[PDB]
Subunit: 258 residues, 3 copies
């Protein structure tokens, strides 16, 4: 056939449709579609000199046995790369991947000419009120947004809930002793577990002026279930830091970077 | 009926088309919500020919007013998965297509993302305007969320969102304890008292050292963010001069 | 007036097939770049005429005697072409330039969270004074494609034009003298500080183990080498140079 196929509908309820139907069995004994069965396709082909070659296609394919549930995907294929985009039965879209774990998945880079808005995971601790253990203050409160960090369940740190990269800064005020003081960020009180890693930034300063801040910083990947703490290295140095409710006396801030 | 449908075109200028046409009446112009056509997939489940994906073209306006349509991509299971509106705007998991791409869910990218990020700065505290409000010699910004140039005394938040802010200023030569604070148009409490934000500040005295103040949390459109000394009598003990190393305010949109 | 294609069987399926050649049936010729292989077109009556109401096209991106390469195009009534999928699999929304795997000409709104690789790098351990505003650093580390902190001991090299947020710190020694460091472009502080489109600052400190800090925020160019250190050699005697990162670090994050 060389003629364009025209489907024309006049009316208020009806529409024009190309309908592609798939069953197993026969018209006399139809059987349910099975996982992996192609329901149908719109196929493009082009002459290359010697053969008709696949030149793009849009496919509907079953992803569950239909006697169990009607679940399908849509596939968009181009000449060259082959399958370029998938829409799974969940509605989840993959570009360059067929594993559609999130609502949109891109196997590659993304370039946007304007701006991107999204929920970003971050959390804070505020108000160092007592020394719990080395490198672990008790904090009066915490707060967080998103799903990667929990800063409210534990009074002594922020819990990492997802593997990821995190940027962390902890500050606390020196008291009035005039002695040198510092705080450090730690993994459940273990400073070395962070500081000794060759894939992170870990630092801290000293201070002595009353009301000035000693600071500690971390940048790098953390593991789910990690409790991030911050505090004085030892009890006698905690005696020389300010412990009180207002956040200006001390805070920890954690941002998910990636 | 059981046979594949083929459309074959040869030659230099023409192409193969499946064309689906819709009118109302028997002829009446297409109305909003009318389907122009669809490619429909159906599969036997043992009881019926069940919807197994479809690609639809649907009118978004009455055609006597304007020819506006959307394209819809449906799957068996979730139903409509992706929409392209007459604006070209794409929705995945939503039919509300406000921006060029809208995703109702999370996005996972294996590589890196480039985009315009909103941020703004104030540089060079040149005088005390009010409690927690310096006059700044200049400002600069990128993007659409923050305006650091219209006013010399603060950065205006143009869009509701989450912001990370740090303000620093140098102590002078008095040896007195000095500090600065970030504020909402001079009102420090309006930020500090919130249980959904970080707000802090340090003291310093050594000449050329920084007092710093930090904020993290949501701000509202039209908010004017300021930073400065808590009281006029302290201004004499801070450094006010043009170079940015004397003091700056940095605002980054986080989300 | 519907068109139905029904298939019963274990392996057979229903297809609409659109084929394109040049030439004639007895003397065909290969598809050329820009030829349409086929299309699904929608049209709607507006009262006067049949108006374009969306289309899905397959179009050649190479001469087929060289290679079979096509794109898919999705057009809507109103804006016209809205999405393109190139032969590489790269997708454009609002643009036909498909440089990356996804390209959006506009804004993007996500209700949830986005995960992606972010470029960042660090230098750790100021071990010597090399030149004004240039420390030698014991080690570097980076993630991503925009920043290289391991090739040069004296800085982080920007590999791609972009916006960067940079903080450098170093500990004062035991003298009680005023010390500072600054971020620089290959030791040239003024090259950054004098720019009206950037933040550049630094502090002084004197207390032993306290930090002097310098900060930068703004755009940088490919091949820029970012350094940080004391302003002059005589001040090195009053800063701490040693391997542990708590003595000093530089952190660079790509912002955009």
């Amino acid at each position: 056939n060389r003629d364009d196929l025209n489907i024309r509908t006049y009316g208020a309820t009806e529409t024009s449709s190309l309908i592609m139907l798939r069953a197993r069995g026969t018209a006399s004994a139809p059987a349910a579609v099975q996982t992996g069965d192609r329901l149908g396709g719109v196929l493009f082909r082009g002459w290359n000199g010697t053969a008709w070659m696949g030149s793009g296609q849009i496919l509907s394919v079953a992803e569950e046995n239909f006697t169990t549930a009607v679940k399908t995907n849509l596939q968009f294929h181009v000449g060259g790369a082959g399958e370029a985009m998938r829409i799974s039965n969940t509605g989840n879209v993959g570009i360059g991947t067929t594993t559609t774990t999130e609502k949109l998945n891109v196997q590659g880079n993304v370039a946007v000419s304007g701006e991107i808005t999204s929920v970003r995971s971050w959390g804070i601790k505020r108000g160092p009120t007592s020394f719990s253990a080395n490198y672990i203050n008790v904090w009066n409160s915490g707060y967080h947004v998103g799903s990667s960090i929990d800063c409210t369940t534990s009074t002594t740190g922020c819990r990492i809930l997802k593997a990821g990269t995190y940027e962390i800064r902890c500050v606390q005020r020196a008291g009035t002793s005039g002695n040198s003081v510092y705080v450090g960020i730690a993994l459940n009180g273990d400073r070395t577990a962070l500081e000794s890693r060759n894939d992170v930034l870990w630092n801290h300063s000293h201070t002595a002026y009353s009301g000035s801040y000693t600071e500690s910083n971390f940048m790098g990947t953390l593991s789910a279930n990690d409790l991030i703490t911050c505090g004085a290295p030892v009890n006698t140095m905690a005696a020389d830091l300010v412990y009180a409710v207002p956040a200006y006396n001390g805070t920890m801030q954690i941002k998910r970077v990636d």
